[PDB]
Amino acid sequence: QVVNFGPGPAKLPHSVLLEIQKELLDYKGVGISVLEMSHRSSDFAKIINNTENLVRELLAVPDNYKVIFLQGGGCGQFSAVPLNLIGLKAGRCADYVVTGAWSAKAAEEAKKFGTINIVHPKLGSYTKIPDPSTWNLNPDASYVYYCANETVHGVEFDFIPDVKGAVLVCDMSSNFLSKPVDVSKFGVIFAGAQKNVGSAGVTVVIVRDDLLGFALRECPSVLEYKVQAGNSSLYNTPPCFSIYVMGLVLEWIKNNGGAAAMEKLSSIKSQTIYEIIDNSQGFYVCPVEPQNRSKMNIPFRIGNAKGDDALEKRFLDKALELNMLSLKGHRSVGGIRASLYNAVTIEDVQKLAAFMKKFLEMHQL
Amino acid sequence: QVVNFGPGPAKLPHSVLLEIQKELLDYKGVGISVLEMSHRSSDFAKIINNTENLVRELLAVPDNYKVIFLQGGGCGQFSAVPLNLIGLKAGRCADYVVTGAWSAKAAEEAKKFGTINIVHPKLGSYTKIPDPSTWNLNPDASYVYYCANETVHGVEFDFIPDVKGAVLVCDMSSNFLSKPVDVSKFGVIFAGAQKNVGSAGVTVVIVRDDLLGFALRECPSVLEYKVQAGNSSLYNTPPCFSIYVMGLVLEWIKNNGGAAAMEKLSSIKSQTIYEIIDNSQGFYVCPVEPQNRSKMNIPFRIGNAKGDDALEKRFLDKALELNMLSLKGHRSVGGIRASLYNAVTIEDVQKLAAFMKKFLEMHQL
């Protein structure tokens, strides 16, 4: 019955958790657990190769791109991206687009490795994507960074920005494989697996193969793109079980229609919630401009623009009573947040939709 | 019927794999998998705190020591230790003890962050520990680094070396919680979970609380001891499932007598194999001096000291027919290597003992 609206780590498909359970003591007959499996064995080589192929297949990754699986999460890439790329041009400058909490954290972290310049004026509220025409781009910048989907504020790019030919780095942790992606436009894409593509413990990084070999001296070898691509992500012991779980979710996505189907399913899901908000007559307020609304994370308030705390606690308390978990908004924003990642089914959103309507039908004045 | 002598990732207790399997879909009745569990939930807080408590209990870690769980494996700490500690003193020097392959790698990685002086002359063969009284120690070095147990060459410290008051850092990946440890004599202890206390994906680090706040600017935030100790290993998403698995293994060690019992069980196991080698009349050759022989990894050759390729293939071939996995020595050394970590039972070792005895009785000249 439990409906898991978790923001990350999130819900995994039930069929995947069933297979992990039944294979847990004897993976496909070899007689051991994946938790016991050597990363140098023929069996795990087949696991990590199939996981990489699915990333290339589902996203249509061109052959001039490496696909490596690192540790440290997305916040690790907040340091791995500058350590690997900020020396690409001698100036060691990088231009950053800050559309929410995770772009801000990444921009601040990069200040530890070079001079970071935010290309747009500071926004009073994380409610819109600054028009790319307003971007003040440095022609000598080593790269340009932006976050595809801001998990805390629900601001998402439905376009790949024009960065005047500079190398493009994109944080796609919260919408990875929720839609097709023109990988050819990017220099580095990274995404933590714990939102749309697996369990916590592994990060997928897609790097253009000529962007290796610019890493700083202080870059840890386990986080250097050049080192890990040359060892097929096996420079040291990889998160074997996380990569095994990730490949199963990737297989689940492929059986369900790939990135194209995920885009359609995430449209039906997000539209179901935005439809309640847009016709709520101010009872639900979503502050994001409609043309930048995320299809993965829908944060909103109850009552008014700043939110009525008394009504929102009653919403969450009744929501928890119905076994709908992790609907509380992020600590820094409060309010409500619904995360509708790939594993969240339509029936799961249909339960949330029915509850929001009955709650609105009981408290609108 | 599989006997798993893996070097890391290694064997987990059958009891632990059963509980992980039973609760994989509905952990302790909360309705979700740990793979789906949020790191901000009350449920995960119980897990990671109990995991931290068990490390403190089983090792008797003093209160002035932080216990943190990081990503990146042991090779991750090969960079995190210099980044966090090489700047204790302004010289940015560090003394390293190279007793095998893993201390050799850590010494080379540290050269990326400072001037590294290896305290002793090159050994020519990794068969002994250089005498600590002959160690050329730098009084202005920031710390002294050594690997307690060399997994590839089978050289293990049965003592804590006197570094004349320097901050002592130790790589205990391959013998962590195989014996009691006087933590007070160390500044930093770290260990990858996959060898003796769990599954790959998480690394435990024990740091004295006065050694924080010396990290270099280039240290990634997810690898900075101060940042991660201040957030109780929750600066970003931790390897939740790997920390969950480790807590069950630690609970298993506690139920089986703690570190004190692990030490004596490790003696029974290693003595069973080392005596077979010592009475083999040269049919089995272990080149490590007996006073430095590892109790965790026993590498040896068959036929003669340099190795009989024909006999070693049949040994590994017949061992595979009998479902004894991962007995092949490391790629860099060849020969045979038997890993006898905590979950490897005396019953497991007796199968290796009987087979080694029968192979000697059938090919000794």
Numbering used by the authors:
A (entry chain C), B (entry chain D): 6 to 370
How is this structure described in the published paper?
Phosphoserine aminotransferase (PSAT) catalyzes the intermediate step, the pyridoxal 5′‐phosphate‐dependent transamination of 3‐phosphohydroxypyruvate and L‐glutamate to O‐phosphoserine (OPS) and α‐ketoglutarate. The 3D X‐ray crystal structure of PSAT was solved in the substrate‐free as well as in the OPS‐bound forms. Each monomer exhibits the well‐conserved α/β fold of fold‐type I PLP‐enzymes with two distinct domains.
In the substrate‐free structure, solved at 2.5 Å, the main differences between the eight chains were found in the catalytic site and involved the state of the cofactor: in chains A, C, D, E, F, and H, the electron density clearly showed PLP covalently bound to Lys200, forming the internal aldimine. Instead, in chains B and G, PMP was present in place of PLP. These results agree with the spectroscopic analysis indicating the co‐presence of PLP and PMP. In the active sites of the substrate‐free form, close to each PLP/PMP moiety, a sulfate ion is clearly visible in the electron density forming salt bridges with the side chains of His44* and Arg45*, and with His335. The presence of sulfate is probably due to its high concentration in the crystallization medium; nevertheless, it mimics the binding of the phosphate moiety of the natural substrate. In general, we suggest that this residue is flexible and might have an important role in locking the substrate during the reaction. In the case of substrate‐free PSAT, a sulfate ion is visible in the active site and its position is superimposable with that of the phosphate moiety of OPS.
